[PDB]
Every structure is written in structure tokens, then in C-alpha cells.
Coordinates of N, CA, C and O and ligand atoms in Angstrom, one line a residue:
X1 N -0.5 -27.7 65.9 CA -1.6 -26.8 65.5 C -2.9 -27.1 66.4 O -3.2 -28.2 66.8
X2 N -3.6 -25.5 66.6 CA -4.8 -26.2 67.6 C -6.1 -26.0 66.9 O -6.2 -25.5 65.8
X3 N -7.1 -26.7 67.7 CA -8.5 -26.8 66.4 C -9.1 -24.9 67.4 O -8.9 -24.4 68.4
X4 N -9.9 -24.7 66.2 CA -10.1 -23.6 66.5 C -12.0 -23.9 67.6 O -12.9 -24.7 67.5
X5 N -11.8 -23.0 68.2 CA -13.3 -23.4 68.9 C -14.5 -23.7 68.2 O -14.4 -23.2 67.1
X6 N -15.5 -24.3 68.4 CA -16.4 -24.8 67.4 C -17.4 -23.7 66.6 O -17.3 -22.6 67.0
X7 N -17.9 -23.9 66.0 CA -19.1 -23.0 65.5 C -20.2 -22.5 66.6 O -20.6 -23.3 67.5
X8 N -20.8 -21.0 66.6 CA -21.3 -21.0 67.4 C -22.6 -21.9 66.9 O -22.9 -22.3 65.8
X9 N -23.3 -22.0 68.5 CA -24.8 -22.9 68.1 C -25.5 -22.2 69.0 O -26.6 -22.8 69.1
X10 N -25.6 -21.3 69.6 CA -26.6 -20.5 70.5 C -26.0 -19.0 70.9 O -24.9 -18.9 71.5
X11 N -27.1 -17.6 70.6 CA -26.9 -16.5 70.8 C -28.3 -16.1 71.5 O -29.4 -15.9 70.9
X12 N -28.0 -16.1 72.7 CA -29.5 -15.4 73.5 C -29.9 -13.9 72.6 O -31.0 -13.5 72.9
X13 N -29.4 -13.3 71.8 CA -29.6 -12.1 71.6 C -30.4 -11.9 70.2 O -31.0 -10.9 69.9
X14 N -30.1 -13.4 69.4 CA -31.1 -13.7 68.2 C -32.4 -14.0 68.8 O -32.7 -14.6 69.9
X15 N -33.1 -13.6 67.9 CA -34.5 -13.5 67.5 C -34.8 -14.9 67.0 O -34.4 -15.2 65.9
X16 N -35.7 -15.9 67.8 CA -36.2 -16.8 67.6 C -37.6 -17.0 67.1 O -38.7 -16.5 67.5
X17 N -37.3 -18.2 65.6 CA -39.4 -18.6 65.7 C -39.0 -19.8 64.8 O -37.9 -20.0 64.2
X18 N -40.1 -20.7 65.0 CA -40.5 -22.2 64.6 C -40.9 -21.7 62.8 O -41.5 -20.6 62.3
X19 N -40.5 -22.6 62.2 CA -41.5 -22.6 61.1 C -41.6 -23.8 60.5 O -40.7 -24.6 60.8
X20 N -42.7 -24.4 59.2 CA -42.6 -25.5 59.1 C -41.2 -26.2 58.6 O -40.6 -27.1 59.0
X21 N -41.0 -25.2 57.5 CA -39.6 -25.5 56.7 C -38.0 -26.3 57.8 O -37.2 -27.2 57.5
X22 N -38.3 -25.6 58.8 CA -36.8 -25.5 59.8 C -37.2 -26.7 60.9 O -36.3 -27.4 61.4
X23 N -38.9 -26.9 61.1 CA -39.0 -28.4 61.8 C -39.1 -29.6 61.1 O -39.1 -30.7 61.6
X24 N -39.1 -29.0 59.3 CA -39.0 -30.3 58.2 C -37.2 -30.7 57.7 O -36.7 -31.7 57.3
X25 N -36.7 -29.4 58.1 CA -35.0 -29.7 58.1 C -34.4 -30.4 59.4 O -33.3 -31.1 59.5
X26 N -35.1 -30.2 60.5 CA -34.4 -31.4 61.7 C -35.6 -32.2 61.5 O -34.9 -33.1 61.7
X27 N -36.6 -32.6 61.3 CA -37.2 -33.5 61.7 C -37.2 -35.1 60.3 O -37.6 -36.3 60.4
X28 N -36.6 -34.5 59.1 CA -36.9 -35.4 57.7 C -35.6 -35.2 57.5 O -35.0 -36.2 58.0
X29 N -34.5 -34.2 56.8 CA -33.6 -33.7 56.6 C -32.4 -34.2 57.4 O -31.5 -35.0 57.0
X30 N -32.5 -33.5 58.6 CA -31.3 -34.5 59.5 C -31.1 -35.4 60.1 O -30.1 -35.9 60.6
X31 N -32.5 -35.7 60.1 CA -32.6 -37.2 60.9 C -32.4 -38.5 59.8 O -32.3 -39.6 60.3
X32 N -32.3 -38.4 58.7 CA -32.7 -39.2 57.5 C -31.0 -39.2 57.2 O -30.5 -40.3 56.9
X33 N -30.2 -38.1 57.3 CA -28.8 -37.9 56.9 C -28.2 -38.7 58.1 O -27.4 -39.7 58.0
X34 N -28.6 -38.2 59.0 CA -27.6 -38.8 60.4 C -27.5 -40.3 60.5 O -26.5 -40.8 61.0
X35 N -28.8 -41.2 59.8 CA -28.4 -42.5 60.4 C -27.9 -43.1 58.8 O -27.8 -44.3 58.6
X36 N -27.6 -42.4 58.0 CA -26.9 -43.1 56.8 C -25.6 -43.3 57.5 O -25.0 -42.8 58.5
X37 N -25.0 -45.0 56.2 CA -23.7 -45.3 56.9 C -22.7 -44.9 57.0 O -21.8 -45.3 57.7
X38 N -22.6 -43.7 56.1 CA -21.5 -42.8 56.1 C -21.7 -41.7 56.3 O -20.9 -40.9 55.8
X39 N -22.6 -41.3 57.2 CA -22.8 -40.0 58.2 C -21.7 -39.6 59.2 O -21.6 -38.4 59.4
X40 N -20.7 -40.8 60.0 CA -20.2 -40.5 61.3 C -18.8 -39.5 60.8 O -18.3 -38.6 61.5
X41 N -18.5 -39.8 59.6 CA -17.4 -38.4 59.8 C -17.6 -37.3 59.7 O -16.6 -36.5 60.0
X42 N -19.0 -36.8 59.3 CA -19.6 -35.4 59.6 C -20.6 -35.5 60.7 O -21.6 -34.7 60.7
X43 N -20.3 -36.3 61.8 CA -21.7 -35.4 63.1 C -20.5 -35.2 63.8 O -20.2 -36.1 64.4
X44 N -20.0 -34.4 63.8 CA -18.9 -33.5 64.8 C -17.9 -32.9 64.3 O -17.0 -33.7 63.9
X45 N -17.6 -31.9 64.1 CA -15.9 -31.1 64.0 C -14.9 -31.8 63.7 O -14.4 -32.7 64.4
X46 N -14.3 -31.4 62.4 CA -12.8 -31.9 62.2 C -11.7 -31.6 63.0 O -11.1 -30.5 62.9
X47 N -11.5 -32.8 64.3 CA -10.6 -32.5 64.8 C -9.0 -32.8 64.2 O -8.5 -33.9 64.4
X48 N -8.5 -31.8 63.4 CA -7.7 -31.4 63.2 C -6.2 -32.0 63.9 O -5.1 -31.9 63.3
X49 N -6.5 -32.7 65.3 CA -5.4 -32.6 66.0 C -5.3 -33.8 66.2 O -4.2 -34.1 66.3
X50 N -6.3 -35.0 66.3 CA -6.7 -36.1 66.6 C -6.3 -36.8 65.7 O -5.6 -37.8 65.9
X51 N -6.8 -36.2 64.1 CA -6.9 -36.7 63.2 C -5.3 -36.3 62.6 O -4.9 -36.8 61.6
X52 N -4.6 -35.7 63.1 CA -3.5 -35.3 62.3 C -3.4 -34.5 61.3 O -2.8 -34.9 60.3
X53 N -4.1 -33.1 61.3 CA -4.0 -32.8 59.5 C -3.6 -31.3 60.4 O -4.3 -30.5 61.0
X54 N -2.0 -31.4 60.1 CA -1.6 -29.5 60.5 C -2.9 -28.5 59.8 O -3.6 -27.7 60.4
X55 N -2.9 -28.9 58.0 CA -3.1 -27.8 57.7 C -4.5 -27.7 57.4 O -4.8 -26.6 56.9
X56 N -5.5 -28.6 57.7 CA -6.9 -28.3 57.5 C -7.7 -27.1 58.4 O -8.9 -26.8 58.1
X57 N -7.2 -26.6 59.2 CA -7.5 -25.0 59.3 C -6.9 -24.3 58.1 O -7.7 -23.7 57.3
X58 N -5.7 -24.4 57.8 CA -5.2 -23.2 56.9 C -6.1 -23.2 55.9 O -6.3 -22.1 55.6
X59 N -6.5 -23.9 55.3 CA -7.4 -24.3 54.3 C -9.0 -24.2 54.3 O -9.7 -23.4 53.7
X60 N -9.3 -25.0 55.1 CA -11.0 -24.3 55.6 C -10.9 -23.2 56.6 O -10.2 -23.3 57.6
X61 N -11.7 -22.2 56.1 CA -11.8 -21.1 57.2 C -13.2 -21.0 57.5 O -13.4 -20.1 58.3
X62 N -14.3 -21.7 57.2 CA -15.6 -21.8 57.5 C -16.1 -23.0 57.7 O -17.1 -23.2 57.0
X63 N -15.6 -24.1 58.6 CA -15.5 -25.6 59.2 C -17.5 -25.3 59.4 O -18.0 -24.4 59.9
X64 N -17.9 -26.1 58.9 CA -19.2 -26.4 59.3 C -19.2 -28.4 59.6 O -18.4 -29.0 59.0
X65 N -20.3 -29.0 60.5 CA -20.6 -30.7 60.2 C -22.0 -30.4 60.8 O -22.5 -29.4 61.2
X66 N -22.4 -31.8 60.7 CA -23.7 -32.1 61.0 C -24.4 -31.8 62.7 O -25.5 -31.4 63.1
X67 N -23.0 -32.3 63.7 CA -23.5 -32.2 65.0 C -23.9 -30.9 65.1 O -25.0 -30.7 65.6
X68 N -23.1 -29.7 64.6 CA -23.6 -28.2 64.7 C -25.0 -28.1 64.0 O -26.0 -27.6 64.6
X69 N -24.9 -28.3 63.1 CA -25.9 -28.3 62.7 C -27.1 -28.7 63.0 O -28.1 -28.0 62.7
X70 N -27.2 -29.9 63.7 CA -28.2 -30.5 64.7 C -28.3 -29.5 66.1 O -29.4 -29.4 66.7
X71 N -27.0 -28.8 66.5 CA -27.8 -28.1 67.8 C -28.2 -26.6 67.4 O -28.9 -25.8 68.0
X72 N -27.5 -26.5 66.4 CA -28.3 -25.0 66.1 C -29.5 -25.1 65.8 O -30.2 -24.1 65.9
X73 N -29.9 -26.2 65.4 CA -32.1 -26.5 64.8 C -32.5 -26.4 65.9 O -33.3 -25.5 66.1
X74 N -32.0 -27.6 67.5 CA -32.2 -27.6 68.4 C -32.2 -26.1 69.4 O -33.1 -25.9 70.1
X75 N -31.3 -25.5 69.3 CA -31.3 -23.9 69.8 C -32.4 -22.6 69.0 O -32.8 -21.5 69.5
X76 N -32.8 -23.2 67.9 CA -33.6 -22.1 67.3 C -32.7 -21.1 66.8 O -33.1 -20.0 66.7
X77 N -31.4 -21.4 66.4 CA -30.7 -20.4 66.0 C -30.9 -20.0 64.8 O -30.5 -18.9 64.7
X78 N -31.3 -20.4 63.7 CA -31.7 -20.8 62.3 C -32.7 -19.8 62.5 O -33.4 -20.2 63.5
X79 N -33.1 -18.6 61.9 CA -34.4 -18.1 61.3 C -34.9 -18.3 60.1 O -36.0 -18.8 59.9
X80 N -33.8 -18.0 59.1 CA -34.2 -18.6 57.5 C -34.0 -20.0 57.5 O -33.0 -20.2 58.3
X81 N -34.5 -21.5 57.1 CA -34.4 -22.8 56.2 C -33.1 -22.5 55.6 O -32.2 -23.2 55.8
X82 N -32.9 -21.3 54.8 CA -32.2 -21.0 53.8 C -30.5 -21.2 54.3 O -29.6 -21.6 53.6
X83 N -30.4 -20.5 55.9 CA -29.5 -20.4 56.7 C -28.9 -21.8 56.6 O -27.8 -22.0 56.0
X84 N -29.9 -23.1 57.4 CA -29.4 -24.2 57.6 C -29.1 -24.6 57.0 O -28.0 -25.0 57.3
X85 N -29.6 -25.3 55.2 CA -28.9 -25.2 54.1 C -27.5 -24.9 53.4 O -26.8 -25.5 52.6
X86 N -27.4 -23.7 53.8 CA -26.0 -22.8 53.7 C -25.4 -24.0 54.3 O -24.7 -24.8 53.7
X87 N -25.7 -24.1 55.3 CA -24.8 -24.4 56.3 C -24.4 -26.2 55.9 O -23.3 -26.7 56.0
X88 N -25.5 -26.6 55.5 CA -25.6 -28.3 54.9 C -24.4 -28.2 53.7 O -23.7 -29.2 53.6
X89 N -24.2 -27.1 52.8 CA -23.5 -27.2 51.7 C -22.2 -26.6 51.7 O -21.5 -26.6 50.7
X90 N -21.8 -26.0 52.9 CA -20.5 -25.7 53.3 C -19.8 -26.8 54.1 O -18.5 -26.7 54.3
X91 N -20.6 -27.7 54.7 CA -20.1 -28.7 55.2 C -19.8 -29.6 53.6 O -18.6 -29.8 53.3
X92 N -20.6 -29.9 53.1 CA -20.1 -30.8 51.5 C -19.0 -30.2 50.8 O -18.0 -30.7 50.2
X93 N -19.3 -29.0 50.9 CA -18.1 -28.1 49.7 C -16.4 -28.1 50.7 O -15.4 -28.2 50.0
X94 N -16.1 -28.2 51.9 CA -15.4 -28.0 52.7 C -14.8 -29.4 52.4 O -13.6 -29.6 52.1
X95 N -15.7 -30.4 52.5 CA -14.8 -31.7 52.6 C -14.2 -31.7 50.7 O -13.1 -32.3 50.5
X96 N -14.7 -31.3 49.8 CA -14.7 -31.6 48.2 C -13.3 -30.6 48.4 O -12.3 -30.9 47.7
X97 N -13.3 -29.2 49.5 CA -12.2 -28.6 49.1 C -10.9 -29.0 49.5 O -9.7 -28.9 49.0
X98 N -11.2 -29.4 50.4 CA -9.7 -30.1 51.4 C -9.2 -31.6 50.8 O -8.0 -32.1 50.9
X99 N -10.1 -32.0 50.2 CA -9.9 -33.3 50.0 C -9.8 -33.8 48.1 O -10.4 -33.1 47.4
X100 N -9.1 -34.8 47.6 CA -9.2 -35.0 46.1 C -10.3 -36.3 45.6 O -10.6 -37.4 46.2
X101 N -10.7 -35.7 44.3 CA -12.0 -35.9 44.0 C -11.4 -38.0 43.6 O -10.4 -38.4 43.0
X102 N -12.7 -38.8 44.3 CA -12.5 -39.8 44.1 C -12.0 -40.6 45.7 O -12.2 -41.8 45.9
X103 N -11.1 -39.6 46.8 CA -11.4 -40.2 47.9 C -12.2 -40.8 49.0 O -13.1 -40.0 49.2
X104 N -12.2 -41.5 49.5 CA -13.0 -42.5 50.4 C -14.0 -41.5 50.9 O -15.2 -41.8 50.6
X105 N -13.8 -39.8 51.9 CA -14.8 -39.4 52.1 C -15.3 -38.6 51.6 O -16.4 -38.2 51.9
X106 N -14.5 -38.0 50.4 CA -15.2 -37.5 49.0 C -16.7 -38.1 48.5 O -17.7 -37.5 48.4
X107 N -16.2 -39.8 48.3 CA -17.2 -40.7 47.9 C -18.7 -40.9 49.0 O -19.9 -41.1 48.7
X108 N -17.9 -40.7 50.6 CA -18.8 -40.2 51.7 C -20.3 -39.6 51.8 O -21.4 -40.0 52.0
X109 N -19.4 -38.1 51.4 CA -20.0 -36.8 51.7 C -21.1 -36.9 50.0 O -22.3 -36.6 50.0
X110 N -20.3 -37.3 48.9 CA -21.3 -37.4 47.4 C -22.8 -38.3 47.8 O -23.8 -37.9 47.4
X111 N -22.7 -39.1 48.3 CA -23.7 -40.1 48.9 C -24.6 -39.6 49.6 O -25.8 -39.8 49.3
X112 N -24.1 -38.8 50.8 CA -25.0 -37.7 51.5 C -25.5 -36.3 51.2 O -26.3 -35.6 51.9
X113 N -25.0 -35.9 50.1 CA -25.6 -35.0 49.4 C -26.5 -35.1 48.4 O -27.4 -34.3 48.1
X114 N -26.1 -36.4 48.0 CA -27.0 -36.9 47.1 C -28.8 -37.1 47.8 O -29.9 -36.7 47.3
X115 N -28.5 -37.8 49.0 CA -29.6 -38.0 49.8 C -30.6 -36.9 50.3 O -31.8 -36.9 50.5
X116 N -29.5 -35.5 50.7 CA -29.8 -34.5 51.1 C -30.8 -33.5 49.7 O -31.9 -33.1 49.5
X117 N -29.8 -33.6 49.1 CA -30.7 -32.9 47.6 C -32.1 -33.3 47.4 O -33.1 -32.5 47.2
X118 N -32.0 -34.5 47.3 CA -33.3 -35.5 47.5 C -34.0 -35.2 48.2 O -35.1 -35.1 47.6
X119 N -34.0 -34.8 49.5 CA -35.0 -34.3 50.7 C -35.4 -32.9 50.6 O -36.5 -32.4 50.8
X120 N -34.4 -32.4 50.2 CA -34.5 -31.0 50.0 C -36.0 -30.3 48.8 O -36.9 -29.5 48.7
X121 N -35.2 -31.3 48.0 CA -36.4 -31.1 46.9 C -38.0 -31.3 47.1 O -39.0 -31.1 46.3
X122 N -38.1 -31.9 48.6 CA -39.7 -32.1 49.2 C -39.9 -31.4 50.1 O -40.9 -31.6 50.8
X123 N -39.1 -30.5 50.4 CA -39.0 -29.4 51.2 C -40.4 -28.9 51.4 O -40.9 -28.8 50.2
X124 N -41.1 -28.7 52.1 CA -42.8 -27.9 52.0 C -43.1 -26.4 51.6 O -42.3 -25.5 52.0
X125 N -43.7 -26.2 51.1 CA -43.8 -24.1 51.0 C -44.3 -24.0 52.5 O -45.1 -24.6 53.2
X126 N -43.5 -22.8 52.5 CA -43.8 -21.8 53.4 C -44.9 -21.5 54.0 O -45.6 -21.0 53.2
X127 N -45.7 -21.7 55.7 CA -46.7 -22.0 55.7 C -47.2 -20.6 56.4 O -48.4 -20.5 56.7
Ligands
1GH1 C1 -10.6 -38.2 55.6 O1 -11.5 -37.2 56.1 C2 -12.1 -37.4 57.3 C3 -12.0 -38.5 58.1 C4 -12.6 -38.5 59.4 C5 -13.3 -37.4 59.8 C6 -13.4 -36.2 59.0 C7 -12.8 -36.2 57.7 C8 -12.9 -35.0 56.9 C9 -14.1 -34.4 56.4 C10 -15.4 -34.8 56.7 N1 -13.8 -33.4 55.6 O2 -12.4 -33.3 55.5 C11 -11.9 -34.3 56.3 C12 -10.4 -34.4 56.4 N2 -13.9 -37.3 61.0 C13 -13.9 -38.3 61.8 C14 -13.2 -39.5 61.5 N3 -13.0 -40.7 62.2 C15 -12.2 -41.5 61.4 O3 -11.9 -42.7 61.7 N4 -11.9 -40.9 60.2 C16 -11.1 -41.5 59.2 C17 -9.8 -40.9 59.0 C18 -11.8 -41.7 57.9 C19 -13.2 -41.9 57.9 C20 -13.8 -42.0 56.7 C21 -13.1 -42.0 55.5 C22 -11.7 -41.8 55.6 N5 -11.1 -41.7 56.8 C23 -12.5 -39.6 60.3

């Protein structure tokens, strides 16, 4: 089985703008997630092929991780906060879906959510 090409992270054709919210989700948000100790199995794509798992395509059909997520903040691809968020909780729900409750990166991904929620919750208003 092959891994499917990555998420996009850049569209010249979207409509770009800064706001505080989206420089407080890369600058607090994923910088704060990235260097926890159990970050490294989410900053890059489940390779699928590497890792051995035929069927975790069949199963996730909306693969999100952290590295994408890091270059889409970096690309400006993100208009809504709201977007990158989505995007933070489909990486958590993908691993809870593929995976059974109580394993090693089950236990992972609960730790980093946990931390994420936390951040989230200091989120700034809209400026
Ligand atoms: C056991 O799950 C993983 C293990 C990974 C991984 C991604 C996943 C993963 C994630 C994340 N969501 O579903 C899967 C499957 N990405 C890289 C990587 N490098 C690496 O050595 N692993 C092993 C197998 C690992 C790490 C932590 C816990 C359990 N197993 C992994």
C-alpha cells in the first residue's frame, strides 16, 4: 500500500492575513506542543509504509499531524484560528480512531491534548 501525498500546505490562490489569534497558535500553541516528550509521532505524516500498517489509509481518510500544521501557519494558509484548530483535533481524533483506548500513543496524543486544551483556553480575543 502507498501513503497518499501529504496535506496540502500552500495555495497561491487563497487569500492571505495575519491575525493575533493565528500568530498566538504558532507562536504559544505549537511551539509549546512541539517540544513536549511525546510530540515526535505527530510532527510529520503517518508513514504508513515505513511503519507497516496496510490499512491506516483505509481507515483515516483525513490524515492531519503537527509538521503540516506547522507549515500551513508558516504559509499563511490558515484564515480562520478556527481552521487550525480543526485541524489540531483531527490529528487527536485520527490517532483515538485508528488506535485502542489505553495504547502507548493513545496515552501520547491524551497528554498533548491535554496541554493543547490548556493553551487554547488562553487563546486572546480577536483583535
Ligand atoms: C503507534 O502509532 C504511531 C507510531 C509512530 C508514529 C505514528 C503513530 C500513529 C499516530 C500518531 N496515529 O496513529 C498511529 C498509528 N509516527 C512515527 C513513529 N516513529 C516510531 O518509532 N513510532 C513507533 C511505532 C511508536 C511511537 C510511539 C508509540 C508507539 N509506537 C511511530
Amino acid at each position: 500500500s502507498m501513503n497518499p501525498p501529504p496535506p496540502e500546505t500552500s495555495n497561491p490562490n487563497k487569500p492571505k492575513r495575519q491575525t493575533n489569534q493565528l500568530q498566538y497558535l504558532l507562536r504559544v500553541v505549537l511551539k509549546t506542543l512541539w517540544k513536549h516528550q511525546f510530540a515526535w509521532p505527530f510532527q510529520q505524516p503517518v508513514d504508513a509504509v515505513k511503519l507497516n500498517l496496510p490499512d491506516y489509509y483505509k481507515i483515516i481518510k483525513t490524515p492531519m499531524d503537527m509538521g503540516t500544521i506547522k507549515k500551513r501557519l508558516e504559509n499563511n494558509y490558515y484564515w480562520n484560528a478556527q481552521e487550525c484548530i480543526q485541524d489540531f483535533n483531527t490529528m487527536f481524533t485520527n490517532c483515538y480512531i485508528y488506535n485502542k483506548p489505553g495504547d502507548d500513543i493513545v496515552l501520547m496524543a491524551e497528554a498533548l491534548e491535554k496541554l493543547f486544551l490548556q493553551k487554547i483556553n488562553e487563546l486572546p480575543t480577536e483583535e
